[PDB]
Design a binder for these strands. Sequence first.
DNA 1: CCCCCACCCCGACTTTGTTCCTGGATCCGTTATGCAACCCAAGCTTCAACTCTGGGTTTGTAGTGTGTCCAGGACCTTGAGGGGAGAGGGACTTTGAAAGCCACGCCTTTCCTCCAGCCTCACCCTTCACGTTTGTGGTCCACGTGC
DNA 2: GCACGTGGACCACAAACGTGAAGGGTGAGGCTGGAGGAAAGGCGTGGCTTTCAAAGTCCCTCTCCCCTCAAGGTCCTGGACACACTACAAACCCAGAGTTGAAGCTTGGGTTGCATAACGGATCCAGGAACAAAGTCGGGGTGGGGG
Lengths: 50, 314, 57, 91, 91, 103, 103, 81, 81, 290, 89, 91
Amino acid sequence: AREAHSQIEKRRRDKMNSFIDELASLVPTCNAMSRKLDKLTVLRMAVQHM
Amino acid sequence: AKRVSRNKSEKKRRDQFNVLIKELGSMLPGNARKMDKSTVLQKSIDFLRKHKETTAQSLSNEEFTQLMLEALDGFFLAIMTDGSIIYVSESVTSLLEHLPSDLVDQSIFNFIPEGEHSEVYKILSTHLLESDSLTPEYLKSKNQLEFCCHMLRGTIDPKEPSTYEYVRFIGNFKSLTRVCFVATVRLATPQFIKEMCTVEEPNEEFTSRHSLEWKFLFLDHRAPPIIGYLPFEVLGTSGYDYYHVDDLENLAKCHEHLMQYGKGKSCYYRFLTKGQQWIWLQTHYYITYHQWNSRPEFIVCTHTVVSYAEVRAE
Amino acid sequence: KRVSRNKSEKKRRDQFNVLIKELGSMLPGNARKMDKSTVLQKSIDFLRKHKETTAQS
Amino acid sequence: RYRPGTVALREIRRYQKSTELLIRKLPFQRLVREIAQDFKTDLRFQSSAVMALQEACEAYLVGLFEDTNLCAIHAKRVTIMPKDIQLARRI
Amino acid sequence: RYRPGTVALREIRRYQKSTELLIRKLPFQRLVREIAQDFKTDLRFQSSAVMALQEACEAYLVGLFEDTNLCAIHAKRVTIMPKDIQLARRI
Amino acid sequence: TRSSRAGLQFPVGRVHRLLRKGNYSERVGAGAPVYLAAVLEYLTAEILELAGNAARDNKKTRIIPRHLQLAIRNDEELNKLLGRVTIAQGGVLPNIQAVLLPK
Amino acid sequence: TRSSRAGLQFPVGRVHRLLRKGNYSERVGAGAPVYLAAVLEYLTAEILELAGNAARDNKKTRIIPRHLQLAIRNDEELNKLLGRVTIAQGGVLPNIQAVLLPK
Amino acid sequence: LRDNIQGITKPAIRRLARRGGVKRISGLIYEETRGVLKVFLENVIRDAVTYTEHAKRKTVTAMDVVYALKRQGRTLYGFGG
Amino acid sequence: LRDNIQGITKPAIRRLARRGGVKRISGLIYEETRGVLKVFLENVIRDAVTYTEHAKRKTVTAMDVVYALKRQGRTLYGFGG
Amino acid sequence: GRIKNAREAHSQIEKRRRDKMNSFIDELASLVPTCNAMSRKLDKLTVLRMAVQHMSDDELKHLILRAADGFLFVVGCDRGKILFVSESVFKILNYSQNDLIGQSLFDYLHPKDIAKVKEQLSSSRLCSGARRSFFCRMKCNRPRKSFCTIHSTGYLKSNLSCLVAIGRLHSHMVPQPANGEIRVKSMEYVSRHAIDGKFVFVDQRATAILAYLPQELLGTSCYEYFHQDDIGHLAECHRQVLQTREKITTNCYKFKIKDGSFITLRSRWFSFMNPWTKEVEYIVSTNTVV
Amino acid sequence: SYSIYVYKVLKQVHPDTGISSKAMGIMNSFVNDIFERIAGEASRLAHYNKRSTITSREIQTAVRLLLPGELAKHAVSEGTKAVTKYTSA
Amino acid sequence: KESYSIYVYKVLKQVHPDTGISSKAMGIMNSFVNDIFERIAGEASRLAHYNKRSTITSREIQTAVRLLLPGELAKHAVSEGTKAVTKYTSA
DNA sequence: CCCCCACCCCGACTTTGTTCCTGGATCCGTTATGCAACCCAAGCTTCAACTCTGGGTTTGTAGTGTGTCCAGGACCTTGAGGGGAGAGGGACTTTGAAAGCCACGCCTTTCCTCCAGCCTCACCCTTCACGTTTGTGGTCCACGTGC
DNA sequence: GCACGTGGACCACAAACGTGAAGGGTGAGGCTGGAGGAAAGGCGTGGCTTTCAAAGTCCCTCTCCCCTCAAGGTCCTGGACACACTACAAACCCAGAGTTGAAGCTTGGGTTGCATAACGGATCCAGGAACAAAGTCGGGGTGGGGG
């Protein structure tokens, strides 16, 4: 059971990575940046864009 | 530029450390060069200790003090009850033409007229007081005193008859590890123009060029900081417009000697700054020639500021 | 060392959470207790709709 | 007239065989004294010095013209241009 | 592939920016000894002397190359030819 | 030292000895060494000044042969005085003829 | 006579004196002026021979600066040794490039 | 005086160029030649005048011209020395 | 010792030409350059060896190279003087 | 082996060096309250910053303040606004600190002195070059006497450049005359005149002695102020001094002043000659109060 | 060698800078080169005038001949000032 | 004052007895002799200095000659100076 | 290929310069003394020579594409060639006196000598600057697991 | 699901490290400077007379000026190929190391040497006379172009 829960946690962290990249796609600055950004930087840019 | 960039950053770390070491060492007392960085830190350690101890057991006031002393036409003076002088401010030389070394350790009554000695002796000797452990002497009304007297002037030629100035002492009696009196001495006759007697820098200089009519053809960037006039304010004007009355004749003699020899060194003289101070100078001169016939074209003048002690010595 | 890694990790998670909360706070029809992924999805939709509606105003 | 170039070749032969000065003397003297006055006035000049200057100048100029001719030839030209002189001097 | 000449411009900038010796020192040293033996065999050299020789040679050649380049430019040409070297040397 | 009496940095005694050697003349007038030392010091000052400017323009604190070459080839009068002179690791000015530029 | 000892025309005494003048050195070995005089005489003979040959080619019996110019500029070794000398009334070699000739 | 540089006439320059084997000449040459010659003369004259001045004389002698040319790297025989 | 003239590589010549601002090089240059260098260097070597010989030495010193360059109008700084 | 050994002693002397330096960095930190209060090993760089940040006078302050006279003021050069003034100004101008601070000196100045003060406020341990000194008329709260003549002396100082100066209201009368027993220096003022006697240069002592400010004398003739009873004598002295280099001293004479009265003066005159041109530059005079 | 004086001069011109040993050797070579030029030219001038002594006149003339006019003016001024200060004291 | 006209003329009669020389050509020759003398003397002086020698000997001259003269001329001049010094030393 | 025109060199006559003869000297040469510059024999240690091993940046050789060099046609305008006219140059002659040269007398400038003593140079010790690695830790993250 | 943990990633600091560059100190003696004197170089005065300046005049070459017309410079166009650019392979250059001793360099000994000076002397230099060469003008022969 714990493996299934941990892999649901992986599904969650994957969903979050995917939505962080999608949110980045809606932020011009993030959409323009080259390096694989660290999560906090993406979210800071997102709250700055809104 | 990858590793050039990392090396730039590391050399910058190096630089920042060096800058901080230099700043740290610059503020110390008894400053000197050739100290190793460890010695710089050790002297900073010692200085922090000493300064913290002395302060704990205790616009700038220096600029205010200078400004007020000058405006009042005055100087600090301190003397023992026996009449012996113990300290004096340098401004005394500009006001009375005595050097501090001519005053210190000497009797004040050598400069006060003999017909007034009894009065100042009474002033100094009649007052006696012992302070408590709580109140500084200068703050007690009993120690404050205001009085007036005449004082002798110095001179460049001892043949001049004795000349004096009336002054007011404003000061207080203070004890020293004997009892002295220390006062701001103000001249009763105001002195709206005065001579600078000590050079505020170890050496300072400025250069110019002059025509065969002695009119300014050039003034360097160092003059305005010294004399207060910008180049355009002097160009075309005669150098004589800025020299002191008594020195006009000696400077004419110097320029005649220069016309005689083409090069040389001048006598001492005074120059009136835009700030209304006569500054003592000495100048080196030489002349340049028009190749077509080897006759003069312009004079070059290198002016050096000098002290009243060197003036009075020769 | 481990205490400092714990501190920096909690700081990382706290910064992330503060940013998630600020991001979600600007949304229309706001409601608390939304899952992080739901916060981001609603933020994605809100950015799309707000940008389009404002641009075409 | 003869076709241009032929008479020039005859002139070239003449002046290469010859040795006399090709410049006018008195204009040269006046030009010298005109220049010299700028360095110093009231100057006096030996005719030997004048002749030395004339010879040196013609020699220098002819050498420079030879180099200029080489440059023009290199540029596939018969006619020399100021650029040829500038280049030769620079080299 | 970059276009002919573009890399040459980057090279020109590089080599003008640098100051290092461009000839390989051992070939140069053996060439020196190959020449020197003709005048005297069993002859030694201070390495510094060899370096001075190499630096003088590279400087001299670089100057001659620059002059030759001016010649080619005068001929309105980019590729330098032995004619250009010969003309420069003659001048 | 005569140099001190002249306010000069260079060793006037050495200069006088060197002029007295080398067989440049039978005698040396006493003012000649001073004059020459002044000239040398002046040229040295000019050169070092230009060199330090070049170094600072490239953010360097140490003068290297490249700086001397740059200074000397940039300065027209020094380039005249030293036109035929060569300097170790001197390099060249970044001169490029316009015809060579691509467009 | 020293010149006679060496079998030479040129004056050894004058050469020796000239070497003691000019401050060329503190001392001068006795054989030095002899060697120098021999070299000078040899070079002089070369020049005069070539100049006389030029004069004869020009059907002349007295040397003039024109002859010296032609001779020195025709002899490659002397031409290299004296390339930068100018000769009063020397003229130039009759050189014309083939490209300039009519065709 | 002045303007004696134009005294270097176009035919004189033609003769000189012809001695240099020059078959054809562009008009621009003449002024350029005058300028070059002016520079050359100015240099030589400056040096000769300097020699004369150091000798404290007022008369220019051919020996000064020769010394000037010598130090300029160009040697002229047949004017003494 | 043989063929060391070939030791002067075509890339070395190219680099020197680039330092000389040269953009394009004809192949004949490589051999032409080798010849010119051989001449120049041989003359310098002859002079330096002549200095060494007069000094009755068996080792060439940089000062001899300096003198050889100096007298050929190639004054060089960096090796004393 | 010998090379490696020589490198050990040297490299460990360098170790001794960095140990000494780190010890002294830590000691210096101990002497900085903030660094000593900080728990963590502060890096050498931050430690040095904090150290440089971390790195009788009142007797003198009273000794000079008790002797003070006039009023101190600070006026911005770019501003003309009085940035500060001492309370003693209320004794002098009768305006208070609050009436002066935050307001511009130039309305308190007389209209013809505003230009002069502006020229003085132009830029070019207080150094003689930055020094400035001028007489001017300043308004008073109670009034022709709506203005009083103030001597202002100060220096220029820096973000907003300003003149720091003392303004003193000197008595134009001469109190406490000299005792006959004592040789005392009388008040004096120097002036220079064109051939016709028109002022071409004058000093501030002339303003203290004559009440006329410098611009009020420059461009005017001395004969506009000489008293007619002495103009004959003074004109004789003038005619004589034009012919000789010798210094001629006049008799005592009367000279008119701004308020309309006369004062007694005695003057020493000479015609100075420039040696380069062999020409008289101008008449030079030192006037003396009798 | 002149390294001491070269260094001191730099410390008067650019106190915040140092010198590579190669640059210092270059300066020594340059000093000796210029010394040789001037001394030889002055020797010739003395000979051209059959003089036995080299003075500041000969050096001034050799400087005017050797240096371009700009540098010549400044160098002549420097020699003049140096000789003036020395002789005057 | 001194010139080499005597020896120039005697040498001319050695090489071309039938031939004379003009004073202009004689001046050319005297200038040449003096020039070569100066070249050799200066080079020999430098040589002696470079070797901290106070004396100029035939070795210094031979070396200066080898340095100054082209190859063929150098061989002949060296042989001539050798013969002259040999005979002079024998005599 | 032949004839005509122009240029280049030679020949003749007149004036100036050079060579040969004459007298006086001092430049050249000899023989002598002197102090020492330099050669020579010898020993001691160094730097250069000579060699090797290992690494790898530079060099060599090869393949392909095109920018450059060259040839070519063709315009059109610039220089050349000549004619013809006019002017300052060139040659030769003259005079004026200024400047360079010379000789005479005085003196003071610098070489030469010896000494004194300290600044510049060499070595030795020590320190700092630097890159540069590394240590070292912190910031932070990716996603595990635990709670 | 979130928070914390650990491993991992990444950043940047922080320190020491040793190496390379530099500077400070002490030894130390060479070299600078000063005193003292001698006598040689130079300044100074007084005079002359040689050379260039400056000009006049006539004859004349050379320069000024104008026009025509073909040739040379130039522009524009097209071809191909010699050169540059990429690639892999190789090597010898570079770096670092070791090993050997010929030559560099110093010391001491002794000599042969060249300078210097006095003195001898005769070939050279200034000057006087005669002959040949140089300058100027005219004629003849050779070289090239045009028909």
